[PDB]
Amino acid sequence: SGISLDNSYKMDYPEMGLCIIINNKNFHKSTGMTSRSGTDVDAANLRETFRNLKYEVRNKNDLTREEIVELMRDVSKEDHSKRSSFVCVLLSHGEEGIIFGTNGPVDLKKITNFFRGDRCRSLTGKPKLFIIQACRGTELDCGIETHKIPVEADFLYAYSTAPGYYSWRNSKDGSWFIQSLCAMLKQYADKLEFMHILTRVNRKVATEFESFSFDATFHAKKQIPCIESMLTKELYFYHA
C-alpha cells in the first residue's frame, strides 16, 4: 500500500462511543447548595448535539456522589472494543478538582482514574473526553476593554472556566460554555479538528458573554474556558 500517516485518532470504529451526561440540578437541602436553573437546557442541547455526532447518549439526572462513582465504575467496565472514543459531560456545582453529587463532593480524579489506560483496556489508545461545566473556585474575571504509553495519556479535559474561577450559567439560555460548545460543534464538527473547535468555543465565551447583576460584586464579569489536553493525536469527528 502507499505511504501512510498516523496523526489522527482512528474514529471509524463501528461505534463513535458513549456520551455520558450527568445533569445535577436539585441538591439535598442539607448540602446548602442551590438548584442549577437552566441546566436542563444544557443537558438537552448536549444530548442532541452528540446524537448528531453519532454518539450513544445516556443522560442521568440528580445523581448522588455514590451514584456518580458507581456509574463511572460500571461504564469503565463495559467492553468498548468496538467504540472509537468516550465522552463524559458533567454539569453541577464544583470547585478546583471537584464535582458535586447531589449529597456531596466527588474528586474528579476518582472519576477519571477508572478510565486510565491500564484500568480500561478497551479504551487504551482512544480519546477520553471530559467536558466539565462547574466552578473551579470563587475568582471573578473583571475583564478588560479591547512498547508502552502513559496511563494519563489520551485524556482531554474541556473545562468551562479557568483554574480557580467561577463558571457562569444563565437560568434561561443555559451555561455560557455549554451553549457555545454545542453551537461550535454543530457548525464545525465536519470541518475542524477538535482542538480548533474548542479554541472557537474559547473565543465565543470570551467575547460574546458578560454577566449582568444588581450585585456590583458579580456584575460585568467575563469568562475564558480552559482546554487541558493530554491527547496524543488529532481528533476529527468525521472519517473517510
Binding site: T34, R36, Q133, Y166, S167, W168, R169, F218
Partner: peptide, 4 residues
C-alpha cells in the same frame, strides 16, 4: 446569570 448565576454561578455554579
Amino acid at each position: 446569570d448565576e454561578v455554579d
